[model samples]
Target: DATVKLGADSGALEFVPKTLTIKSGETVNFVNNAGFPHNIVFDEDAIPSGVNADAISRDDYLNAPGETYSVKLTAAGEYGYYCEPHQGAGMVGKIIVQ
Candidate 1:
């Protein structure tokens, strides 16, 4: 299991860890903070083959502060994702499954 903050107080538009590594099948708890509107958008072309990028991608914003968005990584590979609202701000992150 792992925990990643969607946005940090020190840096409002970035993932706290930025990149995280966890064992496959372990669930990741994505906690929303600082930014009122935050969400995860998985890059279809940047993830492991056979993975459902669309299903992993979140289309709606996590409007509630302290809201948690969890994703269970079942595949063993790397994944790239970003916040649609802050893509321009370079609010991006990655995941490592092994």
Candidate 2:
């Protein structure tokens, strides 16, 4: 499975491998690597058409270390996401599916 690490390098709010590219139907696992909780929220204007932004977003934080959130993209387009609380601090991430 493809993976993206959360706060893996710095002791700050960030999404490691901030941008990723994958094929349609692939699942990317967002794994927590630090103590601070985080969640995924897709930007309204960035995702593909017909995709339910709410369904792919997790409003609840993943509080535990090693906890994971998975999302599979079947749409061929760029998807931008961010952590609700940390987004202002540059915790945004993007996915390009083809």
Candidate 3:
């Protein structure tokens, strides 16, 4: 699986892979390519919608300039998340599972 990239201050209020369609129980990797700090927060109502953003868990990481963070998707669902510092800067992203 490929990882998503969160451009810097790119006015992207949603993360990459916002709408991912994977097989049931398929494992997906959520990579923090924002080149900054980011958080993958899964909204409670997203799982049943086939977007598994939070399936990886509520893990936050301070990504260095070239650092890479990753996670595995255990379920199929829609996932929503936002960056603590960039959220206000319009840094938001989503992940969807089939």
Model 1 ranges with Cα > 4 A deviation: none
Stretches off by above 4 angstroms in model 2 are: none
Candidate 2's residue-wise lDDT over 1-98, tens digit each?
58988886567788878899999999999998863689989988999999989999888999888889998889999999999888788889999998
TM-score on alpha carbons, each prediction? 0.95, 0.94, 0.60
Would you list the C-alpha lDDT of every candidate in the order shown? 0.89, 0.88, 0.57
lDDT of 3 by residue, 2-97 (tens): 566655345354556555566555555555554466665555664564545455555667565445555656465556666666667666666665
The Cα error of candidate 3 at residue 12, in Å, is 6.4
Q: For candidate 1, lDDT tens digit of each residue in 9-81?
A: 7658999899999999999998888775988999998899999988988788998778998889998999999
RMSD each, Å:
1.0, 1.1, 4.0
Residue pairs clashing in model 1 are none
Clashing pairs in 2: none
lDDT of 2 at 92: 94
